[PDB]
Design a binder for this molecule. Structure first.
Ligand code: CA
Ligand code: CL
Ligand code: CL
Ligand code: CL
Ligand code: CL
Ligand code: MN
Ligand code: MN
Ligand code: MN
Ligand code: MN
Lengths: 359, 359, 359, 359
């Protein structure tokens, strides 16, 4: 029900950074810098600007002290300065609230447009950014769990096909999705930069931010993050994983920051840059779709996500999903999942895999 | 209490091989050869003899066709031919049933002694064995999931302290254990070869065999086994993991063979060869003790294990544990576990970690 | 010297495949399939078509039996069917010989244009290709040394600035290069797909093909290839490496096929897709520019490369480089390199690093 | 020939630590702590005591300030206090200078015996040592290049068979060696703890210490050390590697400390604990014996080694090797190596492999 505008879409390069509001800046710094080893581009009493090992733009993450923890903006870099004008014209045509700042909303970004998008999400588009020392060969700084790139965002939204269509018009190409035999869509992944995704839609009450994902070079780097969290005795902040994804084929881990913002660590998905890249649809009941090894998806993964803010700094109202619930149809009392389609052996009914029930 | 014999203990080098009775030989071959990549030393219509990548003795695993799936023998290599005589005298003094075969019980083993030990387990002791091509540099054969060494056995027995004393007198040294503050021992690990263990005791109804473990070179090799099992659509045969252990500090995975014999894949524990190697005791309520990342221990891991045979080839009667159950005290309805000792935050009452309950 | 056409450049997606003429098809099959584990998309008595683990187009490599080993075509996929017409007009304006086949030059490719480009190289441009099973999750087929993508080509040409300009007009963006203070350019790297490169120019006598490069997931995959070649007693076919590159930051290995075609295995370079991606220029005397650890560059690496064919199947005549030779200025009798610029300690004069002279 | 004492050999557990005299304690600290990440057990302005990640004894390396860089002591831990008496009796019967100190020669070691051994080397034997925090699960401290264990020493001595016999009488078991077809032995490896070696003999002018080796968990940890040294622009202190060894099958790297003391980093050799462990002999001309991939051995690796001290703190006089030189017979002007025995193809005459001569 979101029409394709006459105005041309801005040419989006990739996800570039997220601005997260955090309640205790010191505790957040402890998590992102001391635990996760992100690199400080700038900090003061209000904000911490962080980047990954291979990044040359000013930052991939802004942490902003605020009264209520929430996503403040998810930023995409566009190809040219003129693409910021294109973004403004596009979202104006859609009837969305927009705000333009010629000198940026955060440090290290220039001319930028923020919008309350049709799904209620605060998107930023920008070209101009302050270049910093690209640390990609600074092996004197490299940590055993080094986060090397920002990879993607993931958004919770009640109507997946509605948001998918909107993002396709915006230029994202769908790479994978999860549906059932009766035509319900539960999740979709879509890209600009030639990886599996730059953002993704998870069916649920929204708008809420599901997670922000960073890449490592190798699988052992993700293992080290888990190991380090056990050593720091904060294993209760490991939410889910580590595992191999079905959708995306990436090795992964989900952890929780001090304000319960979910962060994914991700590596080794595949190239999607060709225009006829084959799309892959998984059945919702396929127990290898989210964790390839069949490990159960923790219930909080389906229920918990971050608030998002409007352009005034206020929390967006949550709209309830009316389509079927992935949690309910797979691990709920009347849910089921299979290892091999049509096989009772290795299937789970009314509970999760590996012998667990929902707590 | 099992008395310490006057006869000297045999000098045991290491665990060497296990003989498992299996019901369908071809199906077992698929698992151990096609899925796991173990190397065939010899096979016929009745048995398959298998060895790991770096082994020079004839085999690390014998699969024997039989009516009832069970452990037939856990075999330990001894230092000299004379240590077989020492083993016979020692077990005779213990009042155990023993059987001596100068030409072995299985192919590729010479003079051998099998015993029904004081815990009801069929142990074998041998020195003589047919050497085979050591494949340790045969990288033309090397699998992405290559199993490189046999590492240990793990035994389920109802009275851990009783068994621990007997194994210590036999010359095994305890490296780690799990106890509570009320005097109960739930598990013990013990070695000869200078890794964390060659065998271990897990509290539970017994005698039953908990598992046999093989090691890989690197953590990615264990990940590959998981990935391959996903590709073969047999993820339902992944029981638990992959993870990082607390006890042993090893990276691990538990999988189930066609007869539900449990196999662990293991890597990167530490050196224990010094005689004053510090013994580590974990509290049973410590949620980082079995999985360091705090992932829940699947209930089947605590309840399921293989039958074992006596020397007549009949299943040993099972004696029920009367000591407290690790399952019940940690993940049962009256259970408890913590992330940080003395912290209510990150503790679990009457359920498992990460949002699950007993299925 | 090469003027920019008024005709619009074809939109090039990425390098896609190379066709190499080989003298003994069975011996070449042994190397690419049995040693390297590439996947067969088609074969007969004259040709083998091969693809990497994550590929969905028909092939990344075609081996064609012929009398003289040579590069027959380096192919790039274009974005649309219409881009093939654009490519034809473009090279026609450049005065280049073109050949258009509506049904393709090799199996699994449709409408295609081959050209003898301004530097004498046989380029192919195509859109249409037969999709095949994408093996990216086929872990039951995954080799310990699995080649996962085709990454790039590398071309030897006598005048690097002349070639660079031509490739820039064609849409390729320079990411890194090697120069000296006197203004000679020795090599340049350039991309379309958002990695360090899709092709590269290496100063030397040309046209010759320096190498075709495939990527692995992890560094250990590359180490396995070396280990395997050791076990096969073909370590003499390991030309150079393994190492870490300075330029590109990739972990790497160079090996030689039966006809001495050079293959690079490559992993873990960085993202270059932003239009203002920072260009990196290294000094030719920096001993960390090619191997980051300062290991010496094998002289054959600088002197040997494959013949290339014209459109008639005849070898292209070679034109000698008149600019300074990288070998001569770094490892030759009158050459030098440094570890730290301006520091004589860790410098090498008239010989290579690590105590070696030219053989 | 060194006679076999009537007195029993001390039961040696393993190599335990080395004491190296260094000329600038601060510069050595930067190398061993800052670059390499070893853990400080104790330090003052005269000495730094260092241990590996998984160690529980007080230290694996003592750096002692002094006027001439040299080995002061190579220490082996013995099984019981009584074994220190046995070692004293054993070396006294050998006619060797001994010194016994009930309170140790260095901090954190108790009753200890130091000897000037028959080959001129300062050996220490001890049981008593101060236990420290075993850091094996301190992943909060874990470096991307983490050194996890002390693995072995390597000694340069002119007469290898002479030394080998002495070490065998002492209880070391030979695992691998290098010989030629004319009866010359160039090197031998021997163990107590069940890895390939605890010490080794390299033929050359001696006594000199060739190197001390530390283990990592995985091959990428060794890669990271190289990468870090490149980032620190100290790649000139990488002497040789990284590589795969033929002998030992271990992945390796050799680096040089501020006083040119050689340190090897080493991982993933095999189990040798069985008393009939198959002994492997390589031919000296086999180009895969030292580097399995055929990479050339740096001439400094054959010529350079550390001074060793006597018990009075004076440099031991060097005795020249009269047997053939491994350098000369393989990579010298009159040397030879092969890839495949008997095959001229892939062989090297009067030069090193991969296109190099000696600089
Ligand atoms: Ca209690
Ligand atoms: Cl997922
Ligand atoms: Cl466990
Ligand atoms: Cl290079
Ligand atoms: Cl060596
Ligand atoms: Mn994600
Ligand atoms: Mn185990
Ligand atoms: Mn290349
Ligand atoms: Mn060594």
């Amino acid at each position: 029900e979101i029409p394709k505008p006459v105005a041309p879409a801005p040419d989006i390069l990739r996800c570039a950074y997220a601005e997260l509001v955090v309640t205790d800046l010191a505790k957040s710094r402890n998590f992102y810098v001391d635990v996760l080893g992100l690199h400080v581009s700038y900090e003061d009493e209000n904000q911490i600007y962080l980047r990954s090992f291979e990044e040359f733009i000013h930052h991939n993450l802004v942490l902003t002290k605020g009264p209520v923890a929430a996503l403040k903006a998810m930023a995409f870099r566009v190809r040219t300065p003129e693409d910021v004008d294109k973004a403004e014209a596009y979202y104006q045509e859609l009837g969305c609230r927009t705000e333009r700042r010629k000198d940026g909303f955060v440090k290290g970004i220039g001319d930028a447009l923020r919008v309350e998008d049709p799904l209620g999400f605060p998107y930023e588009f920008f070209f101009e950014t302050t270049h910093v020392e690209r640390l990609h060969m600074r092996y004197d700084l490299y940590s055993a769990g080094e986060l090397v790139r920002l990879d993607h965002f993931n958004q919770v939204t009640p109507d997946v096909p509605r948001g998918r269509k909107y993002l396709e018009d915006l230029g994202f190409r769908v790479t994978e999705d999860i549906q059932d035999d009766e035509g319900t869509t539960y999740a979709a992944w879509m890209h600009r930069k030639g990886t599996v995704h730059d953002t993704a839609l998870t069916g649920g009450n929204g708008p809420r931010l599901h997670h922000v994902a960073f890449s490592t070079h190798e699988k052992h780097n993700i293992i080290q993050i888990c190991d380090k969290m056990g050593a720091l005795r904060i294993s209760d902040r490991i939410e889910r994983g580590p595992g191999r994804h079905g959708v995306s084929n990436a090795f992964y881990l989900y952890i929780l920051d001090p304000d319960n913002h979910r962060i994914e660590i991700y590596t080794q998905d595949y190239y999607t840059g060709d225009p006829d890249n084959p799309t892959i649809t998984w059945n919702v009941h396929d127990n290898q779709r989210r964790d390839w090894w069949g490990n159960p998806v923790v219930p909080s993964w389906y229920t918990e996500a971050s608030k998002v803010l409007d352009l005034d700094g206020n929390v967006q109202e949550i709209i309830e999903r009316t389509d079927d619930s992935e949690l309910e149809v797979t691990i709920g009392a009347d849910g089921f999942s299979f290892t091999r389609a049509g096989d009772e052996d290795g299937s789970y009914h009314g509970q999760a895999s590996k012998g667990f029930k929902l707590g």
